[PDB]
């Protein structure tokens, strides 16, 4: 479980009152699963176990009484609290001690990502020394976003946090990776105008010192929206449907433990008869007749 | 004085795992609002304010959180935890001290009405004096309720939970109506079927005493199914649909309560002031004005 | 004594859905189990019209007739009128003067979509109102879009306004509407709006100005879908989706309206049934004559 | 110089009456668009510019009245008709004169794709000199379609159309690539136990000949589901949560053309000129800005 992540899943939980009043949005279903579900599953396809998730005073122990240490799947799961959502970039503070002096990545807790070879498209980002990657992808709001501005030719050379004036439609998704210098950048930094901590603010550190990759994550891949109420019936059906049409599961935690060999067929067996009433039990056992 | 009622809203919800391993099902979002709003709003338009909930011992306290004393919206509200979720009966097992020597109204946290005259609907039910009343409702899977057989003339002649063969295609609903005979018939309630003190034996008591009401709720009336994770997104979806288009809500506690003079202009604008921040707040507010 | 005759109103531009409605007709288009027109179709059903006239486009026309038919099969009867340009719904009767002839009317418009309990009933006393007009007003979030209607302190209709800037409420005005006989001359007598089109909203505030207009309230506990664009149409056909699949019933079923009411008999259903007894809407006809 | 592609684009579409009754299926809009731009957009994104489209007496020529000789996207159209749906394999006897010594692919009328590097997937079957490309994809019920078994080391070992008891979940999808030998094949093609002139048939002769490449098409990538009335909504609401999102547009030809050269912008506006009242012209004409 040596490589390191962060999944950042409190929030203030304004937007969707009154849904998130006694609910941490992670733990809303995305059609047939936790949100949360989706973001560690995309941590583990980069290779990633051992996971610090941070959330609310509130909702923290929710999630450690969902998941546990993760030993279940082969991981190593870990919790800290957000006293309050101070920004994007808090997380390196609080997950300070468990960054060590490792490189990590930072996954935003509602943040689905889909689409073929993710793995690979992850895959330059863990494997670089020094410096940090995120992605850019093509929306029509980019406003809401972490706006990335590129040369005539595809060069960045821009970050603007929300802009009044996006200078591009290609907004900075909630995936990121860092080296080890990002603890201490986001130690310095003052919060916004917005008055936040702004994950923007590192971002344009490393671009200034010209170690940021902008890798692109073109049209064919989903970023599902996860903003409004509405937003969130339309990544569900988006996952029914893929899941319905292929017979699979998406970002389903234990067969990605179990196509990784994070975990054997005795212990997908254990983990799938207390669900076998339901698809997801029966699943499961399935994957095991190997 | 106040008419009372009682929301179950706990199960084990088994058949919705993973999701309700993290989450309360009465507490997953039907749209833009919890599910328990749905069925507290049915209460309401009856004109019953004194509500009793139950939930699990994990749980109760979350709802507790969420919806208070109810002297907010002008109602009354207790709770109760339910150990084990040992049938829908048990209900009035658990209420018995709050319920008295009073009538009592159940309805399943589960259970999401919409249409025209809801009110009209429930009338005779909530003024019957003597006996219990149920609503029978179409649908294509009969075998998975309590199904409810008429003869020619349509006379309630049998009631069968989980039939093998069901006699007709009319479920009964999640909403009853009952005088105070309720409480003692529960206490002789035996295991029968499936480890559960049923709902069924009790209406099948009343069918045999003669006074079972079965009033018809017809086709342009929705009984959204919340049974699957599918379903729950048809729910979400249905429930949208009709808000988008109206710029209106769907039960809406705050919004009923002030429609049917519980609380006033005052306690509204009370009530928003400190979620204008937010866009159900925003609605409130609009109340206020039009 | 008069009857009531029925208008379906199904032309128009088809720009807003381009190119969808290069290809098909948008009253064509399908609500999920169905053609849309089939909605609306059985809204006048429900009323008891069954003498329907129906117009569209020059090129759609034929096209509808082609599904239809003469709406015997149904215990209907059905005919078919071109107007040429969409110049305007209130031409509707200048177009069917000849088929109303000297009774009342009913315009339901071809990508109308109602559905809820008691619809029947709501429409009743616009039904057997012997003289003036009845329209039906909803509560929308995006009155700018509609005809809209003013209601004073007591709730009595005052006055309507077609796509108003500053919409004077969040009512408009449903794509259904009741008339005497009076309508056909209203109709030859407008002159189009600045805009260039014979307005219906002119018509009704005519009626509204002689006292002769009832505005009935269409209750938030029903539906009235929106087609105006691709995402409403989604919308509308997983509403209904979701209505049907639950119930093992069907939505706006002329088959079904028309042996409920007694338009046709089991026998007749039977007849229609059989040829289709391999898909799944011909099942459902023949369920019916079962049990 | 150009390449060359069948759309089959017929079968009688009972199974959906009535809504088929008075329009062909594959004219049926999936959200913003009719069916058959899909397919269509398939076999431009593959480099293919030549195009026949077959269908039934009567639908043949509502097709040919939509799309004209596809000049106006930078193509080659023309029209057949097949009498009667007698088999997929009859696509190449239809179209032997118009394939005449070239290659050729097929794809299904009903076929939608997408997803992240397809044009790539697609470019390795086209370039192929000698042999077929058949693309296997994880589906449900695989029972409704071609399904492929494979080897203890996952080489695809046999083929069977429709069986009653699949071998895989492996289906293989409605798109195909062939050299020039398969229209001999399909000429010398003996009804099936079905009634029918298989496509399978003629991929089970490659297979043999060791001139099959069976494709695996993953799970990242979608292929959605045509045969219901719910399969069209869900396919619909697909492509919708995609295109919102992104702010732009699944499979728009118009689009394919311009990105690929096949014309310039002076033609895009051209096109967009009676589109250009609703959102379809704009995006046309704002791709000729910005
Ligand atoms: C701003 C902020 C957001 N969040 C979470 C909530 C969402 O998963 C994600 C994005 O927040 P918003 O969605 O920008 O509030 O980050 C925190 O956990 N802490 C924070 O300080
Ligand atoms: C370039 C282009 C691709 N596509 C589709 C084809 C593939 O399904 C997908 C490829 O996206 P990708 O760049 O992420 O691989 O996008 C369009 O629909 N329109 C276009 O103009
Ligand atoms: C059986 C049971 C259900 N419930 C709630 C949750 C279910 O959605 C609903 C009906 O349960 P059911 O699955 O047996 O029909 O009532 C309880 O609160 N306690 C119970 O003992
Ligand atoms: C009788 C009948 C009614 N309807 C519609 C008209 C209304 O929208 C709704 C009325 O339902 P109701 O029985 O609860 O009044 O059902 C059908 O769609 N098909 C039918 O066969
Ligand atoms: C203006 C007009 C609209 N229509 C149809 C098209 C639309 O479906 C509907 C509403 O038109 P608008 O809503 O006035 O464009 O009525 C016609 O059939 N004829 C007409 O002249
Ligand atoms: C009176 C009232 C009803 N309702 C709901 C209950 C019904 O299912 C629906 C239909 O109203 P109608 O009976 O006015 O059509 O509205 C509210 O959501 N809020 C309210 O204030
Ligand atoms: C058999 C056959 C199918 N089709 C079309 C109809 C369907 O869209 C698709 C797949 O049909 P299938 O499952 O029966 O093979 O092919 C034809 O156009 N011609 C035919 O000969
Ligand atoms: C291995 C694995 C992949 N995935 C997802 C991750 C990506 O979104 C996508 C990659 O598919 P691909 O095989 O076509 O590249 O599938 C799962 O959801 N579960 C899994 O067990």
């Known amino acids: 479980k040596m490589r390191k992540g962060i999944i950042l899943a409190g929030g203030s939980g304004t937007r969707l009152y009154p849904v998130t009043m ?9 059609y047939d699963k936790p949100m949360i579900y989706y973001p560690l599953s995309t941590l583990m396809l980069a290779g990633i176990r051992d996971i610090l998730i941070i959330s609310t005073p509130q909702d923290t122990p929710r999630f450690q009484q969902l998941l546990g240490d993760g030993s279940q799947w082969g991981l190593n799961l870990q919790y800290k609290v957000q006293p309050s959502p101070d ?14 002096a490792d490189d990590c990545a930072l996954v935003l807790g509602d943040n689905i990502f889909y689409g073929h070879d993710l793995p690979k498209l ?7 020394e ?5 992605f850019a992808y093509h929306v029509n709001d980019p406003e809401r976003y972490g706006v990335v501005e590129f040369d005539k030719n595809g060069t960045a050379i821009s970050l603007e946090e929300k802009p009044l004036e996006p200078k591009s439609n290609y907004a900075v998704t909630g995936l990121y990776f860092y080296d080890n210098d990002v603890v201490q950048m986001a130690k310095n930094l003052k919060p916004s105008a917005r008055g936040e901590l702004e994950i923007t603010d590192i971002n344009r550190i490393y671009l200034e010192q010209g170690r940021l990759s902008v890798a692109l994550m073109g049209r064919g891949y989903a970023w599902l929206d996860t903003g409004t109420h509405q937003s969130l019936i339309e990544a569900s059906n988006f996952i029914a449907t893929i899941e319905e049409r292929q017979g699979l599961k998406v970002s389903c935690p234990e067969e990605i ?8 067929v005795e212990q997908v067996r254990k983990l799938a008869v ?17």
């Open 122 to 128: 992850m895959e330059a980002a863990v494997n670089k």
């Open 130 to 134: 020094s410096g940090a990657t995120v």
């Open 274 to 290: 207390p669900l076998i009433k339901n698809n997801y039990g029966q699943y499961l056992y399935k994957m095991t007749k190997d």
């Open 257 to 264: 433990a179990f196509r990784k060999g994070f975990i054997d």
């Open 87 to 100: 920004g994007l970039a808090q997380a390196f503070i609080i997950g300070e001690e468990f960054i060590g």
């Open 22 to 30: 006694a609910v941490s949005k992670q733990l809303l279903p995305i």
